[PDB]
Design the sequence.
């Protein structure tokens, strides 16, 4: 049913952003090790590039699956053409906010990396930048979860107005 | 409306704190305004249920210190409304503020409750009131989200 | 589906290079159903790059592509992409990633990489993705999911 479609897409998108955040946090703590050889540094960048690509692919896959389920509902007549419009617009918006969160996380991780390379070597002065990145990443996770629930909640309330 | 947004914040936070074992007093048309307060109370309950089912208990996900409390609140809220507003995100904003207040009290930072309430009223008055009024005011929310408002 | 996969790679990379004003023929010397798959892949790659243009160019820049290092950078990233499984979105991201490497290669006067990346992509598709693709109904499944 149309309500389960938007809900499932929202949970999946939020979940992929949480996976991305946890990887970037984990990669940034390894970039803190003083024994980090240039070999490990190359591998952390490859893991960061792969994590971003995976999040992009996985978020998009959830949205395409959701749109396909939405089109199945209107052809089965379980949803009229105005309700399909609303569900597709809500899936488009979820893709937008999830994609922004992914881009945000990538940019902040890059900024956090660049700061580590200009900061000192001791634990203090850039565990600060590590804590900061974790702090920003949690805020992005929470805001996306809030928007995902809130947007699905509002989709339901406006369906009745159709 | 300035103090009515403040009184909506205080009503909602008082309710959410009381559900988690606390009293607002520890830390601090009237007809139409009571319909808005009741509809927002019930909507936050429903929002927090859906959030817990989908993820886990909202309070259990939050961390705060008095030194980072303003940034914790503002960064989430700025991202929540970054690309726009709808009634569901406004409910999310209230539920987030209530859960942040409960977390603060739970961790012996009850001095933050009145601060969050003020930050919420300021964000409502400065950033959400134009949209709220443009969309028919809080009575439109009541018709849409109140559980006894339609047949 | 060895040769149809190579053709998919060449078509997609040719398209991504022409969007940057570059011509495939300068870098290499390489019915109705195949054209629907190609079109769907082109549209999906554009949609991916619509929302993540900065993220793609950022990460390719961060990989410091050179002829001496590009193969391991490609293979390591792709191995991590698919480490815990395959889905169509990851396959589109795999194409988009290879397209961004090729563009970056022409930009940095490393045109020799374009046909190398195409071979690495076709090899990876044929050896590591084609079993999942066939198990999931073939490329027509992708057209039904991602096609517009």
Sequence:
């Amino acid at each position: 049913d149309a309500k389960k479609v938007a809900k499932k897409a929202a949970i999946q998108a939020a979940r992929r952003i949480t996976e991305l955040a946890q990887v970037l946090v984990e990669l940034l703590k390894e970039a803190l090790k003083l024994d980090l050889t240039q070999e490990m540094r190359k591998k952390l960048i490859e893991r960061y590039a792969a994590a971003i690509i995976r999040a992009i692919g996985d978020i998009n896959n959830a949205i395409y699956q959701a749109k396909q389920e939405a089109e199945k509902l209107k052809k089965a007549g379980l949803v009229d053409s105005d309700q399909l419009d609303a569900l597709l617009r809500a899936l488009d918006e979820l893709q937008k906010v999830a994609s922004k969160a992914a881009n945000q996380l990538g940019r902040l991780f890059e900024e956090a990396l660049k700061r580590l390379d200009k900061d000192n070597g001791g634990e203090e002065e850039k565990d600060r930048t590590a804590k900061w990145f974790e702090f920003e990443a949690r805020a992005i996770e929470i805001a996306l979860r809030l928007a995902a629930i809130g947007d699905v909640f509002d989709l339901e309330k406006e369906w009745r107005k159709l | 409306m300035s103090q009515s947004n403040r009184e909506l914040v205080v009503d909602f936070l008082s309710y959410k704190l009381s559900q988690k074992g606390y009293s607002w007093s520890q830390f601090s048309e009237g007809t139409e305004s009571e319909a808005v307060k009741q509809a927002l109370r019930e909507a936050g309950d429903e929002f927090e249920l859906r959030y817990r089912r989908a993820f886990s208990d909202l309070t259990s996900q939050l961390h705060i210190t008095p030194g980072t409390a303003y940034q914790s609140f503002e960064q989430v809220v700025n991202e929540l409304f970054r690309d726009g507003v709808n009634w569901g995100r406004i409910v999310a904003f209230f539920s987030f503020g209530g859960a942040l207040c409960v977390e603060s009290v739970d961790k012996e930072m009850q001095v933050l409750v009145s601060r969050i309430a003020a930050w919420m009223a300021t964000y409502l008055n400065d950033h959400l009131e134009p949209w709220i009024q443009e969309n028919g005011g809080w009575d439109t929310f009541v018709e849409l989200y109140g559980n006894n408002a339609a047949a």
In short: The helical segments of chain A are 2-30, 38-75, 81-118, 124-160. The domain at 2-160 of chain A is CATH 1.10.132.20 (Topoisomerase I; Chain A, domain 4). Chain A has one domain: 2-160. The CA atoms of residues 38 and 150 of chain A lie 44 Å apart.
